[PDB]
Nucleic acid binder design. Structure first.
Length: 74
DNA sequence: CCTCGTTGCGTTTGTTTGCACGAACCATATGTAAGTATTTCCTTAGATAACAATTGATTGA
């Protein structure tokens, strides 16, 4: 669960970074500072919970690989 | 000499930090007990020598 927690934290932080701390705050309903500080404080803890809760999702690179394979075959 | 690559500067977009501000949850401080109830213990071992101070008896006047 340790490495799953690390993976989930990395995926979450990547999603926030891609969407944008400012944009993520605007969509969530908080201030950019709140997202910036959740990234430091709770995202690791929530990530460990997800690792235990077994909510891990497919890594996006392998997702792109699967999409490409499904396009090439079909 | 003109022209093109490198740097100084400002601009735009985006992110983390420093204060101040509720909110809530626990930590502290304080108060209130209405059968009667009434003067404490406990500890500790086999030194020895020297020196003053203090207190008590003896004696010169």
């Amino acid at each position: 669960k340790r490495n799953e927690a690390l993976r989930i934290e990395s995926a979450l932080l990547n999603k926030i970074a891609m969407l944008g701390t400012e944009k993520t705050a605007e969509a969530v309903g908080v201030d950019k500072s709140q997202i910036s500080r959740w990234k430091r404080d709770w995202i690791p803890k929530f990530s460990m919970l997800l690792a235990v809760l077994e909510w891990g999702v497919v890594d996006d690179d392998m997702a792109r690989l699967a999409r490409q394979v499904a396009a090439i075959l079909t």
